[PDB]
């Protein structure tokens, strides 16, 4: 049976996607200090854009990014390195 990954995420992982008020974004639940933001494109198919506080998902791609302006949609400091992931619905 599948289990939820909690760090070092890869494509195909079952993940827990939670709303992060501080960062105004959905993120992957993780025990690492590193941020994994849910790609905007993924929100409609996951029923997270009319919000719902969580949903299970399966990572479908993963991108390593870096914030180049102090104001950004992720609310992270200038220069922050972070990941953006696309995820789709998962069901048992």
């Amino acid at each position: 049976s599948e289990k939820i990954a909690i760090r070092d995420f890869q494509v195909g992982d079952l993940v827990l996607i939670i709303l992060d008020e501080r960062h105004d974004n959905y993120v992957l639940f993780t025990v690492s200090p590193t941020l994994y933001f849910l790609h905007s494109e993924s929100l409609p198919a996951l029923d997270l854009k009319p919000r719902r506080p969580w949903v299970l998902g399966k990572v479908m791609e993963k991108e390593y990014c870096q914030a180049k302006k102090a104001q950004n949609r992720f609310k992270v400091p200038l220069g922050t390195k972070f990941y953006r992931v696309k995820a789709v619905s998962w069901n048992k």
Partner: peptide
């Protein structure tokens, strides 16, 4: 988009 970019793993 514009305020962030993809970087090399």
């Amino acid at each position: 988009e514009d305020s962030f970019v993809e970087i090399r793993m």
